[model samples]
Target chain A: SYQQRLKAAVHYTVGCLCEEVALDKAMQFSKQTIAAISELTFRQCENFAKDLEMFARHAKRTTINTEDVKLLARRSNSLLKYITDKSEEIAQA
Target chain B: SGFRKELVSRLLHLHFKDDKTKVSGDALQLMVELLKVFVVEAAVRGVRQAQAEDALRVDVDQLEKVLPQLLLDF
Candidate 1:
């Protein structure tokens, strides 16, 4: 039931985030919107897994490392920066 | 506060081409954090899309409207 668990986790996280956004926007998300977001997040996770695998393979490695993930976010400047910073923080700790 | 490492590990295992392929512990943990950020950003953008239409509540339509740009950005 990995799909169920992952979808539930994604649903819960999206709901929590929507609440945070609601506080500032004074707008709430409809139930259908939450479901839609959960679906999108689940699909995105699949895409991410594929991307990670390909990045590792491209480097002639059987293991996925932080570098592969950094490469995955290369198209998005802010996302790449955030991930790079988090990776460094984890390394330093 | 985020995804369980065990679950994330299983997810990666499901997509890996080789059963022997692995993920470093640090990389696994970072992936969990990345997913968290991705969801948060998506929610924020959904709200923005709703606001653009002056809607009182964010509906599925708003989510659909923001999805293309959101996916491209991520």
Candidate 2:
């Protein structure tokens, strides 16, 4: 938050990089003007770090597989699928 | 470096789009997110631009103009 310039540069680069990595990762990319910088009022980086650590551990486990990753990657979940399917059926009828 | 620069240029165009029309709150927020990512990265680029400071340092005018329509009253 402090390194006004650093934060600016990092966010800029992150945006560029993430877009390259995955279109989804691009969703998280962001930057604002010096005055408009959004304060991280509730995001506890420490807590997030802990959660990330746990996720990392689970992510590395043998049981979970690419299917798990695929599941997470799908933007449309079951509810969306069900709605779209119902709509298609209605259209067909 | 030009590649990155070009990429930013493309992203900037994409980021500020809708641009002329009245921006929605979500759009404004999304734009901010996009800018935050961009400048943070440009700063990290360090010394790629001239040491004169102004060269790499994007001015408020450039930034303001590129901002979402909602953020700016005009």
Candidate 3:
């Protein structure tokens, strides 16, 4: 099932995101690129979701709301800013 | 990806087993993440030890040599 982690979605993500860099920098995504990104994102996102859940429960909330996510994103300024921008977009709607 | 998910799951299962115990999914994931660091660092150290001895691959001996110190730190 390890190989199952490398699927169409991960390949699509690698192609769209990395090929832009590849187009500019002149390096194609290697065979391992898809798997690497798939694996990396899976690991990082898994922990982030868990930590955000804990923060939500600590604040005595049943649902993982935006504030819990923002608190978790505090570990990185760029991440925090990106999340804030997206949250504002949601509010704008 | 770095560590085997099933193995980690099994470890967690063994670590917490009671008639009333309920290990949450998030707790299992957190332990798996922590194990990734432990496993990766030990593998790295084991690799260096093996290479220093002109070995092409890390053997059990290499891992055993460093595991005590790593576990002691835990």
Candidate 4:
């Protein structure tokens, strides 16, 4: 199922990312910590999916667009900036 | 390098109110990227939390400490 596969992918990525960031500091992440991070990410994905749906609905549109996505990232300055830049980059294509 | 587009697409569809609701191709791609960044940021912050305590390894306690702010910021 996609659910399990998605969860595993998130888990694997968290493991790899922890290793990457910890490499320089000679630090590491415990197994429990990795699991915790993976679970959190999966839950966030669920929230994101709902936010996308509601954003589209609020605009009385069935189609989710870049604007809805931009609104989703409004709480995070860096994330919002990245999405806007990428949105324009795609628009130029 | 991150999530499979097909999987993410399926996930989003499952959460939408209507089956006909659609996501633009570019919007879908941006979502994939957003998911990646979210995970990466969380991992980095977890490591930083461990470092702040001079700990040798990141543990569930460290993750717990950083999670609230992480979720809020995102």
- Report backbone clashes per prediction: 0, 23, 0, 0
Q: Considering TM-score, where higher is better, how would the candidates rank from best to worst?
A: 1, 4, 3, 2
Worst 10 residues of 3 chain B by lDDT: B12-21
How close is each model in CA RMSD to the real structure?
1.6, 18.0, 11.7, 1.9
The global Cα lDDT (0 to 1) of model 1 is 0.82
Worst 10-residue lDDT window for candidate 4 chain A reads A17-26
Q: Answer with 1 or 4, whichever has the higher TM-score.
A: 1
Q: Whose lDDT is higher: candidate 2's or candidate 4's?
A: 4
Candidate 3 backbone collisions, by pair: none
The alpha-carbon deviation from the true structure for residue B48 of candidate 4, after best TM-score superposition, in angstroms, is 1.3
The alpha-carbon lDDT assigned to residue A21 of candidate 1 equals 68
User: How good is model 2 by TM-score?
Assistant: 0.20
lDDT of 1 by residue, B13-61 (tens): 7777678789988899899888778777777888888889999888898
- Residue pairs with clashing backbones, model 4: none
Model 4 Cα lDDT, one tens digit per residue, A1-93: 767877787688767766776785577888998899888877887788889888999999889998899998899888889888877877787
Question: Model 2 Cα displacement at A28 (Å)?
Answer: 21
**Residues forming the 10-long window of minimal summed lDDT in candidate 4 chain B:** B1-10
Off by over 4 Å in 4: none
Expressed as tens digits, the lDDT of each residue in B14-51 for candidate 4 is: 67777878999888888877877887787788878888
Error of 2 at A56 (Å): 1.9
